[PDB]
DNA sequence: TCAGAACATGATGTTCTCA
DNA sequence: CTGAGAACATCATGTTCTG
């Protein structure tokens, strides 16, 4: 589906997953970022287009479970 | 030491009934805002999300909530 | 085709008016 | 010594523009 991470229109694959513009950025500043992003439910967070903002630590996530890298180096 | 008692919203050292009740200058300023403009907020979870001090970024949807809880209101004239 | 500058903003706290 | 509302100054995510 588009964005296998926020459901919302990929601009296509990004990092290695099909992503939308956003989801590129929040991978890209949360990985080289640091932070302390802590879920206030149950790590089970549902993550669209408007739901997404929210739970950073799911979402980051997300964007490790669905393959997602940066890239060693 | 510093710790002058806890916001009934968050739970950080809130400080003088706020809206009509014990909230922090945070959620003081969160109230006013949720109410004036259009928000319609959505939580990504089970309706029961942690607010504590940390956290209360996480979801407005229920932190607002907990505002509406708490008897926050305007009181108005 | 995809990276990331980069310009949008957005949301949020903590003061500092004042009455 | 209140308890509100600017208006700051701060972050955090989203969009277009650039190679
Ligand atoms: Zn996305
Ligand atoms: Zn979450
Ligand atoms: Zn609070
Ligand atoms: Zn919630």
Same mark, same amino acid.
């Given at each position: +589906?588009?964005? /296998?991470?926020? &459901? #919302?229109?990929? &601009?296509? %694959?990004? !990092?290695?997953?099909?992503? %939308?513009? &956003?989801? @590129?950025?929040?991978? @890209? +500043?949360?990985?080289?970022?640091?932070?302390? !992003? /802590?879920?206030?439910? +149950?790590? #089970?967070?549902?993550? #669209?287009?408007? +739901?997404? @903002?929210?739970?950073?630590?799911?979402?980051?996530?997300?964007? /490790?479970?669905?393959?997602?890298? /940066?890239?060693?180096?």
């Amino acid at each position: +589906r588009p964005c /296998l991470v926020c &459901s #919302d229109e990929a &601009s296509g %694959c990004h !990092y290695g997953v099909l992503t %939308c513009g &956003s989801c @590129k950025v929040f991978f @890209k +500043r949360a990985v080289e970022g640091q932070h302390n !992003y /802590l879920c206030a439910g +149950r790590n #089970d967070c549902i993550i #669209d287009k408007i +739901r997404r @903002k929210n739970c950073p630590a799911c979402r980051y996530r997300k964007c /490790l479970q669905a393959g997602m890298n /940066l890239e060693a180096r």
